[PDB]
Design a binder for this molecule. Structure first.
Ligand SMILES: *[C@@H]1O[C@H](CO)[C@@H](O[C@@H]2O[C@H](CO)[C@@H](O[C@@H]3O[C@H](CO[C@H]4O[C@H](CO)[C@@H](O)[C@H](O)[C@@H]4O)[C@@H](O)[C@H](O[C@H]4O[C@H](CO)[C@@H](O)[C@H](O)[C@@H]4O)[C@@H]3O)[C@H](O)[C@H]2NC(C)=O)[C@H](O)[C@H]1NC(C)=O
Ligand SMILES: *[C@@H]1O[C@H](CO)[C@@H](O[C@@H]2O[C@H](CO)[C@@H](O[C@@H]3O[C@H](CO[C@H]4O[C@H](CO)[C@@H](O)[C@H](O)[C@@H]4O)[C@@H](O)[C@H](O[C@H]4O[C@H](CO)[C@@H](O)[C@H](O)[C@@H]4O)[C@@H]3O)[C@H](O)[C@H]2NC(C)=O)[C@H](O)[C@H]1NC(C)=O
Ligand SMILES: *[C@@H]1O[C@H](CO)[C@@H](O[C@@H]2O[C@H](CO)[C@@H](O[C@@H]3O[C@H](CO[C@H]4O[C@H](CO)[C@@H](O)[C@H](O)[C@@H]4O)[C@@H](O)[C@H](O[C@H]4O[C@H](CO)[C@@H](O)[C@H](O)[C@@H]4O)[C@@H]3O)[C@H](O)[C@H]2NC(C)=O)[C@H](O)[C@H]1NC(C)=O
Ligand SMILES: *[C@@H]1O[C@H](CO)[C@@H](O[C@@H]2O[C@H](CO)[C@@H](O[C@@H]3O[C@H](CO)[C@@H](O)[C@H](O)[C@@H]3O)[C@H](O)[C@H]2NC(C)=O)[C@H](O)[C@H]1NC(C)=O
Ligand SMILES: *[C@@H]1O[C@H](CO)[C@@H](O[C@@H]2O[C@H](CO)[C@@H](O)[C@H](O)[C@H]2NC(C)=O)[C@H](O)[C@H]1NC(C)=O
Ligand SMILES: *[C@@H]1O[C@H](CO)[C@@H](O[C@@H]2O[C@H](CO)[C@@H](O)[C@H](O)[C@H]2NC(C)=O)[C@H](O)[C@H]1NC(C)=O
Ligand SMILES: *[C@@H]1O[C@H](CO)[C@@H](O[C@@H]2O[C@H](CO)[C@@H](O)[C@H](O)[C@H]2NC(C)=O)[C@H](O)[C@H]1NC(C)=O
Ligand SMILES: *[C@@H]1O[C@H](CO)[C@@H](O[C@@H]2O[C@H](CO)[C@@H](O)[C@H](O)[C@H]2NC(C)=O)[C@H](O)[C@H]1NC(C)=O
Ligand SMILES: *[C@@H]1O[C@H](CO)[C@@H](O[C@@H]2O[C@H](CO)[C@@H](O)[C@H](O)[C@H]2NC(C)=O)[C@H](O)[C@H]1NC(C)=O
Ligand SMILES: *[C@@H]1O[C@H](CO)[C@@H](O[C@@H]2O[C@H](CO)[C@@H](O)[C@H](O)[C@H]2NC(C)=O)[C@H](O)[C@H]1NC(C)=O
Ligand SMILES: *[C@@H]1O[C@H](CO)[C@@H](O[C@@H]2O[C@H](CO)[C@@H](O)[C@H](O)[C@H]2NC(C)=O)[C@H](O)[C@H]1NC(C)=O
Ligand SMILES: *[C@@H]1O[C@H](CO)[C@@H](O[C@@H]2O[C@H](CO)[C@@H](O)[C@H](O)[C@H]2NC(C)=O)[C@H](O)[C@H]1NC(C)=O
Ligand SMILES: *[C@@H]1O[C@H](CO)[C@@H](O[C@@H]2O[C@H](CO)[C@@H](O)[C@H](O)[C@H]2NC(C)=O)[C@H](O)[C@H]1NC(C)=O
Ligand SMILES: CCCCCC/C=C\CCCCCCCC(=O)O
Ligand SMILES: CCCCCC/C=C\CCCCCCCC(=O)O
Ligand SMILES: *[C@@H]1O[C@H](CO)[C@@H](O)[C@H](O)[C@H]1NC(C)=O
Ligand SMILES: *[C@@H]1O[C@H](CO)[C@@H](O)[C@H](O)[C@H]1NC(C)=O
Ligand SMILES: *[C@@H]1O[C@H](CO)[C@@H](O)[C@H](O)[C@H]1NC(C)=O
Ligand SMILES: *[C@@H]1O[C@H](CO)[C@@H](O)[C@H](O)[C@H]1NC(C)=O
Ligand SMILES: *[C@@H]1O[C@H](CO)[C@@H](O)[C@H](O)[C@H]1NC(C)=O
Ligand SMILES: *[C@@H]1O[C@H](CO)[C@@H](O)[C@H](O)[C@H]1NC(C)=O
Ligand SMILES: *[C@@H]1O[C@H](CO)[C@@H](O)[C@H](O)[C@H]1NC(C)=O
Ligand SMILES: *[C@@H]1O[C@H](CO)[C@@H](O)[C@H](O)[C@H]1NC(C)=O
Ligand SMILES: *[C@@H]1O[C@H](CO)[C@@H](O)[C@H](O)[C@H]1NC(C)=O
Lengths: 203, 248, 337, 334, 102
């Protein structure tokens, strides 16, 4: 509300200030050209009207400069608005924190004086689930030892009560059963890997 | 350095005045062209002003800082001279003099009670344009206007301008912290950098001064106007840079 | 690589009546005849500052657990480390040789301030209770205050921003959010970042020592440059320009009070001590007009600068969200490389 | 007073600019350089002649006369030869009957008074006795060499007409002063070495060795020196800017720099930047800020609170080792 | 689709004393009382031009091997092609009709 009100007030004020400068006589007897030519002979009247001409040209120059500056600023703002429309309304963005504070769900837009208002609908968590996570699995086939890591670095690996391995995203808690296609086999192991045999491995 | 105790007299040689005393001296030898060296202290040196005084900053100014001659007055010594502002190439100069005409003459002296005048109550004697003789005189008692007064005293000293032996103008009492007196050949007097009074343009000025039994040594500088960047802290000069070269 | 981005301006409060009239009761009645002239200037200046404060406040935040971990002492201790991380000596580890120059330390004058922040705030007045005692001659700031020009602190402050950045730094090693301040070693977080860049398939021959040594040496050479490497020079020049412009703008406004505007004097008390009121009023009207024009120009320039700092702060918000609080998938956004 | 300054009788809640106090009756302090005392009075006699026009209106004659004091065998040019002076005007009126012969006193309709108006001079005649200093001031009835001139006018109950002109020759300086102590630690109207203003003068123990007086960048006097003992005095304005907090049309507090009461408020507290006076019974507090300003806020009971940064739980980290937390229970924010 | 973006301005240097005084020795002596006025103007311009130069120079770069291939003549030849692309006549191929104007 504050932004919209300020925009409207500033626009109005610029034109008001431009109009109010026609009541200024720039070291002349009057600010009315008709009165000047009605009261003075042409040789003196022209020298009187020159001051008004110069002052009004200066006022117009000031108005033009302020208008161009405002237009550049609004050009930058319009670029930001286009980015918001393309990446928050017409699609779902992978940028963190771009479409509001939280996990962006969707967005809607409405028209406002000189622009737009965006309604960003985001997810707000109220609780955390605690799980014991693992960085990989150190598998021993009796004598041969290898390691298993997760293809997708965006997933967390944990174990349920029945000691089955599950994967979950970190944006929301949506556990799923881990399969053998979710892992990459590597030569070495790690001290932070979990020890398991081929019997307990994912199917 | 002399130390006398109970009739026993000892003396030490001092190469650096600051080392033996802790504060810098005011005796210096101007470089080629008449410029003050780069590490000078500017102790009894002030910026001349006819207006308010700058307290701290940096300013490019036209000031009497070109030293035609510097005269060091030896301890227990008398400085007497009738100087007309036209050349200051004397044998008393410390260093190399210049043959330019002199604009200002500065006495860099603590004008305490130990300062005595060999002209009597007169401190300065001015011969002005047309042969008119004015005199600056400080007395131990007040003098009525157009009247006359009616070795050292103690107490306030009231200073006057006398034209024909009669008080013409009242200047005031001598303050306790006068550190420099600068006189210009156009008649302007600066005390601690401020123009307190002016007279007719001065054709020639005479003086005869001594510091008595204080043993203090002081200087007289004959100076000309020059352009310089001056840095000031607490109304005191810290550094002077002359615009005498391309990089400068 | 080092980058400086400006987030806020320094707010300035102008008492228009005291600037135009130097407290003179006769000038105030004359200025009253200019309807809503001081009110417009004051309202514009206040609205701009309120909008900037609102925009800034919706960006800064802290978390207590991350603040408990963001110090050189905490990173050098093994107190908060989770029990599984028993082999590690402390949180900072081999990276500490650099992190000591960026993290806040208790060996500092202000809270949540680091060594580099000290160097920046020294290389590149807010209390006005001292300007009223009259124990000495006033300085520049007290005189400006006497002329109706005040510099105030805003919501955006050197204290809030230091808390913000310290919490951001300490949140990297915070292992969980539900309860107390549990911590993980810095090398574990660096390994997670490396895995995000490319899946590491050599779990045995890890060579994080090379990266840690390079980081320590780079941070040391940056700290040297900040106290006595082209990115550092560009950042220093940008900060110096930003600081200089505001001071020049403030001083140019004070130098306009010494302008006669085709009047006999520049002092209102001097005009009212020499002229009868019918003529003194006509002499003071010109000063009123000129001193109002100067304030209008100052307001216009201030609003333009606030408009540009708005976009600068938007860029800073994007950099924090996508380079500090996450790992960006945009090519070449968080530096060259 | 806040309503009158804000040009509205209904004040919305917020902070408004006020003065720490108001200046009423004050004493006058004048400081000048030492000089002899020699004072002169300059009496100017103006004899006006009036007639009645054919329309019945008073007309002031151009045969009105101005007489200056006698100097060097003349009364057309009088100048100052002393250290101090005062000026006075003595007026007389006579009547005529179109014959330009003035023999009768001025009647009630024709009675006029002599007034000296500014004309083209940069000072007023009545303001000469207000400690103005010149190097030369000298009045004439002839226009040659004059820097400016006053206007001599006759004022009647229905009119005012200029009859004569008085010319002035002057040179700026401090040798001659026109005339009609030092007050410390109270607001006073000061004229110190030609610098005029209103403020408080205090004695400091600072030691500045150079100069007489000191000014600011805008030209305001900040201090001066006593020419007898070299003691520096400081000059400050006797009011400063303050901010009054208005909630529901009443004053609840005020931020200021002077530790003195203002706006009727009695209690106060100290913050690292200012003094906050309030109606709240001071000797923190828990209340909701009604209004906000800079980094602080003011409640409805006139109490001061400091606004803190926002707090959050924290960001989820991309770590899979040990005990980790994943958000579960989700609602919607817009 | 075609887009234009401005990257830099045209820098300008002003000699303050030559603009105000047309090389007049007497006018310069009066301008010394405004030495701070001209120094403020010149420093503001020089610092703005130094900062734009710093930011432009950290944005542009070249690759020596990429500049060898960047010509219409090199796209019309098969000199630089990997030998496993012997079935292709040149680099440009059928896209050379539009790449010859770029
Ligand atoms: C003309 O008038 C001036 C007044 O402006 C007199 O100046 C002062 O005179 C005294 C006496 O000689 C000088 O005193 C010396 O000060 C040294 C300390 O000084 C510097 O640092 C302090 C900071 O605390 C400054 O305030 C001070 O101004 C100095 O710049 C002391 O170290 C000296 O004494 C010590 O050393 C000697 C020798 O080693 C020992 O014998 C002593 O016991 C003692 O340990 C000494 O006290 C003072 O510096 C002068 N101030 C100035 C120049 O600003 C002139 O003396 C006076 N001249 C004449 C002709 O009368
Ligand atoms: C405090 O206030 C006083 C009073 O205003 C100032 O006084 C003036 O000081 C300047 C010196 O800075 C005096 O200037 C000199 O005037 C001489 C006489 O002028 C006549 O002759 C010249 C030609 O020779 C004519 O142009 C002029 O119209 C006069 O007819 C000049 O001769 C001086 O110039 C000579 O010397 C300079 C070097 O000093 C050379 O460069 C010149 O080429 C030339 O040889 C010079 O112009 C001035 O007269 C004083 N005015 C008075 C006495 O009323 C103080 O300057 C001021 N002090 C401060 C510190 O602000
Ligand atoms: C971006 O968006 C996120 C949301 O995703 C915001 O973060 C949330 O911010 C709120 C506000 O700070 C946080 O909630 C606060 O938590 C405090 C701590 O909770 C303790 O007490 C409760 C019981 O009251 C226990 O259940 C809990 O376990 C803790 O022991 C609460 O004390 C706060 O209560 C609020 O209301 C009361 C009632 O008036 C006040 O007395 C309090 O002072 C306080 O205002 C409050 O619930 C919340 O936890 C954050 N959630 C997450 C997921 O981070 C960010 O702030 C937002 N960022 C920006 C910049 O706006
Ligand atoms: C700034 O960066 C330079 C590198 O560009 C740093 O110089 C480097 O300093 C290290 C020492 O910390 C040198 O180390 C090699 O280190 C081992 C350590 O055991 C030592 O045994 C070897 O003899 C050798 O010194 C490294 O070679 C050196 N590099 C160069 C190019 O000299 C410099 O210390 C940094 N400055 C800081 C951090 O302030
Ligand atoms: C998320 O919310 C759900 C629903 O409120 C919580 O589930 C409840 O948990 C409590 C405590 O264990 C049980 O007594 C209730 O029976 C549960 N409700 C249902 C409908 O099953 C759940 O605990 C929350 N998640 C957390 C706190 O992590
Ligand atoms: C001057 O000489 C006298 C002695 O003639 C010095 O006084 C002596 O000071 C020392 C310490 O340095 C004392 O132990 C002696 O007792 C003193 N002697 C006498 C006879 O009193 C004095 O310090 C010297 N003054 C200086 C060096 O400034
Ligand atoms: C400066 O004044 C001193 C002190 O008055 C003068 O010294 C006197 O010189 C005359 C001869 O010229 C002697 O008769 C006096 O006895 C001296 N008085 C003393 C020593 O106290 C000195 O001549 C003056 N210097 C001049 C005029 O250049
Ligand atoms: C003051 O200076 C004037 C300068 O003219 C001196 O008068 C000259 O004195 C010399 C002495 O040799 C005569 O030859 C000249 O003829 C004099 N010139 C004029 C114009 O009269 C005068 O003597 C000085 N006064 C004092 C007391 O020394
Ligand atoms: C102003 O002074 C003039 C000149 O002294 C006065 O006019 C003279 O009046 C006397 C009679 O008192 C006549 O004899 C003279 O002939 C008059 N002189 C001229 C030149 O006309 C005049 O009366 C005075 N005006 C007043 C007093 O208003
Ligand atoms: C400058 O200082 C002098 C000396 O301290 C002051 O003169 C004193 O004034 C008081 C108050 O009028 C008198 O009681 C003393 O007798 C005066 N002493 C002397 C030695 O004259 C003087 O007032 C100070 N100047 C100002 C402007 O206050
Ligand atoms: C993660 O939290 C679990 C509980 O959810 C911890 O397991 C408990 O550890 C305590 C302390 O040693 C024991 O008293 C409990 O019996 C354990 N509970 C169970 C169900 O086994 C576990 O230690 C934590 N893990 C880490 C790495 O800190
Ligand atoms: C600046 O670098 C460019 C390449 O980035 C140099 O261009 C080479 O110029 C030589 C001599 O004219 C040519 O033979 C090469 O073919 C050019 N190289 C390429 C890749 O086109 C240029 O000479 C360099 N300038 C300087 C002054 O060293
Ligand atoms: C690419 O090279 C070919 C082969 O040299 C060019 O085609 C020749 O064009 C010339 C005129 O420039 C004709 O006389 C030849 O007959 C053409 N040769 C053919 C068709 O085999 C062709 O112009 C070049 N294309 C470019 C430079 O865009
Ligand atoms: C002795 C030769 C003439 C001296 C005339 C003295 C009269 C007036 C000058 C007053 C100077 C005041 C300077 C400041 C003194 C101080 O700081 O104590
Ligand atoms: C015949 C005149 C040729 C001018 C050539 C200009 C030479 C060098 C560039 C000067 C301006 C540099 C931009 C501002 C930065 C700075 O001043 O350090
Ligand atoms: C796995 O076994 C190794 C020895 O092969 C042992 O050092 C390590 O602690 C074990 N890890 C776990 C998580 O039990
Ligand atoms: C003054 O000295 C200069 C050299 O410094 C010399 O050229 C000039 O002729 C001298 N002037 C007089 C008048 O002796
Ligand atoms: C001045 O000194 C004389 C003697 O030299 C003495 O008679 C007179 O009283 C003194 N005046 C004062 C005011 O002390
Ligand atoms: C100065 O006084 C003497 C007597 O002491 C007198 O003869 C002479 O005329 C006077 N001169 C002037 C100019 O007053
Ligand atoms: C003026 O001074 C007198 C003492 O001389 C003092 O009593 C009085 O209060 C002062 N007047 C004002 C208006 O401050
Ligand atoms: C000047 O006029 C006053 C009254 O204003 C009078 O008392 C005094 O005697 C006159 N002085 C003269 C004529 O010197
Ligand atoms: C001035 O005039 C009087 C007559 O009033 C005359 O006696 C005297 O001599 C004149 N003064 C001079 C200096 O000539
Ligand atoms: C303020 O509270 C104190 C006790 O804290 C009490 O003595 C005093 O009377 C109170 N003042 C009021 C209510 O005005
Ligand atoms: C404000 O925040 C700081 C920093 O977290 C904290 O120490 C302080 O207690 C907070 N103040 C209040 C009133 O909660």
């Amino acid at each position: 509300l504050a932004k919209v009100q300020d925009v409207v007030n500033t626009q109005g004020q610029a034109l008001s200030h431009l109009t109010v400068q026609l009541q200024n006589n720039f070291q002349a007897i009057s600010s009315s050209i008709s009165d000047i030519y009605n009261r003075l002979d042409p040789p003196s009247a022209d020298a009187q009207v020159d001051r008004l001409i110069t002052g009004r040209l200066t006022a117009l120059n000031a108005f033009v400069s302020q208008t161009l500056t405002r237009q550049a600023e609004v050009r930058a703002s319009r670029q930001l608005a286009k980015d918001k429309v393309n990446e928050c309304v017409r699609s779902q963005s992978q940028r963190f924190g771009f479409c509001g504070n939280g996990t962006h769900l969707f967005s809607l837009a409405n028209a406002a004086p000189n622009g737009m208002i965006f309604f960003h609908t985001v997810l707000l968590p109220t609780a955390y689930e605690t799980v014991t996570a693992w960085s990989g699995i150190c598998a021993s086939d009796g004598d041969h030892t290898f390691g298993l890591v997760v293809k997708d670095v965006q997933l967390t690996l944990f174990r349920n009560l029945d000691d089955k391995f599950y994967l979950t995203p970190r944006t929301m808690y949506q556990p799923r059963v881990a399969t053998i296609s979710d892992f990459v086999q590597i030569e070495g192991c790690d001290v932070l890997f979990v020890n398991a045999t081929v019997i307990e491995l994912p199917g | 350095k002399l130390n006398n105790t109970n009739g026993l007299k000892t003396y030490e040689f001092c190469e650096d005045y600051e080392y033996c005393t802790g504060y810098a001296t005011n005796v210096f030898a101007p470089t080629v062209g008449g410029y003050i060296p780069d590490g000078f202290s500017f102790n009894n040196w002030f910026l001349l002003t006819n207006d308010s005084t700058f307290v701290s900053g940096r300013f490019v100014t036209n000031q009497p800082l070109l030293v035609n001659c510097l005269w060091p007055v030896p301890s227990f010594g008398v400085a007497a001279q009738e100087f007309c502002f036209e050349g200051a190439q004397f044998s008393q100069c410390n260093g190399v003099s210049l043959n330019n005409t002199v604009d200002v003459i500065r006495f860099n002296l603590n004008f305490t009670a130990d300062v005595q005048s060999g002209m009597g109550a007169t401190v300065f004697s001015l011969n002005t344009t047309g042969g008119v003789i004015l005199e600056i005189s400080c007395y131990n008692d007040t003098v009525r206007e157009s009247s006359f007064y009616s070795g050292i005293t103690d107490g306030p000293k009231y200073c006057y301008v006398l034209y024909n032996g009669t008080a013409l103008k009242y200047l005031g009492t001598l303050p306790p912290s006068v550190k420099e007196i600068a006189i210009s050949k156009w008649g302007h007097f600066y005390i601690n950098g401020y123009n307190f009074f002016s007279t007719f343009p001065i054709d020639c000025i005479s003086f005869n001064l001594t510091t008595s039994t204080s043993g203090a040594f002081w200087t007289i500088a004959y100076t000309s106007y020059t352009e310089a960047l001056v840095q000031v802290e607490n109304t005191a000069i810290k550094k002077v840079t002359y615009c005498n070269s391309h990089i400068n | 690589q080092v980058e400086y981005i400006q987030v806020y301006t320094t707010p300035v409060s102008i008492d228009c009546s005291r600037y135009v009239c130097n407290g003179n009761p006769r000038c105030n009645k004359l200025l009253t005849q200019y309807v809503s002239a001081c009110q417009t200037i004051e309202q514009a200046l206040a609205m701009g500052a309120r909008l900037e404060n609102m925009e800034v406040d919706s960006m800064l935040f802290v978390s207590e657990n991350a603040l408990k971990l963001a110090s050189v002492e905490a990173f050098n201790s093994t107190e908060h480390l989770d029990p599984i991380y028993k082999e590690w000596p402390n949180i900072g580890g081999s990276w500490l040789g650099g992190l000591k120059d960026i993290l806040p330390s208790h060996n500092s004058k202000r809270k949540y301030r680091s060594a580099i922040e000290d160097l920046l705030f020294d290389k590149v007045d807010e209390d006005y209770k001292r300007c009223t005692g009259g124990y000495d001659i006033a300085d520049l700031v007290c005189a400006q205050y006497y002329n109706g020009i005040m510099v105030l602190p805003g919501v955006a402050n050197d204290d809030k921003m230091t808390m913000y950045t310290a919490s951001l730094a300490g949140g990297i090693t915070l292992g969980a959010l539900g309860g107390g301040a549990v911590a993980i070693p810095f090398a574990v977080a660096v390994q997670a970042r490396l895995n995000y860049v490319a899946l590491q398939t050599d779990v045995l021959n890890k060579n994080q020592q090379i990266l840690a040594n390079a980081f320590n040496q780079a941070i040391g050479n940056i700290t040297q440059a900040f106290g006595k490497l082209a990115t550092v020079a560009k950042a220093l020049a940008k900060v110096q320009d930003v600081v200089n412009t505001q001071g020049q703008a403030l001083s140019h406004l004070t130098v306009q009070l010494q302008n006669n505007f085709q009047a006999i004097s520049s002092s209102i008390s001097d005009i009212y001590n020499r002229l009868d009121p019918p003529s003194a009023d006509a002499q003071v009207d010109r000063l009123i007009t000129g001193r109002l024009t100067a304030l209008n120009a100052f307001v216009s320039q201030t609003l333009t600068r606030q408009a540009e700092v708005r976009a600068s702060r938007q860029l800073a918000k994007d950099k924090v969200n996508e380079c500090v609080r996450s790992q960006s998938q945009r090519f070449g956004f968080c530096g060259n490389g | 007073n806040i309503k009158c300054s804000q040009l509205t009788a209904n004040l919305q809640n917020g902070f408004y600019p006020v003065a720490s106090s108001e200046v009423g009756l004050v004493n006058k302090s004048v400081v000048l350089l030492p000089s002899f005392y020699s004072h002169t009075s300059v009496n100017i006699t103006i004899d006006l002649g009036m007639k009645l026009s054919g329309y019945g209106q008073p007309i002031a004659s151009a045969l009105s006369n101005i007489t200056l004091p006698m100097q060097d065998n003349n009364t057309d040019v009088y100048c100052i030869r002393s250290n101090q002076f005062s000026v006075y005007v003595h007026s007389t009126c006579k009547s005529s009957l179109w014959d330009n012969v003035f023999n009768s006193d001025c009647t009630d309709v024709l009675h006029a008074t002599a007034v000296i108006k500014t004309g083209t001079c940069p000072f007023s005649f009545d303001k000469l006795n207000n400690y103005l200093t010149f190097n030369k001031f000298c009045l004439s009835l002839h226009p040659v060499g004059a820097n400016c001139k006053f206007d001599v006018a006759a004022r009647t109950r229905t009119n005012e007409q200029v009859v004569r002109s008085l010319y002035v020759i002057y040179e700026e300086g401090d040798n001659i002063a026109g005339v009609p102590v030092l007050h410390l630690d109270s607001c006073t109207d000061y004229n110190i070495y030609g610098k005029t203003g209103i403020g408080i003068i205090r004695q400091t123990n600072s030691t500045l060795l150079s100069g007489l007086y000191y000014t600011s960048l805008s030209g305001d006097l900040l201090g001066f020196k006593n020419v007898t003992d070299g003691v520096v005095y400081s000059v400050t304005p006797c009011d400063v800017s303050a901010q009054a907090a208005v909630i529901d049309g009443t004053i609840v507090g005020a931020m200021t720099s002077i530790n003195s009461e203002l706006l009727g408020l009695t209690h106060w507290t100290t913050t690292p930047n200012f003094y906050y006076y309030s109606i709240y019974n001071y000797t923190d507090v828990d209340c909701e800020p009604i209004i906000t300003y800079s980094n602080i806020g003011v409640c409805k009971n006139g109490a001061l609170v400091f606004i803190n940064v926002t707090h959050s739980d924290g960001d989820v980290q991309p770590i899979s080792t040990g005990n980790v937390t994943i958000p579960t229970n989700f609602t919607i924010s817009v």
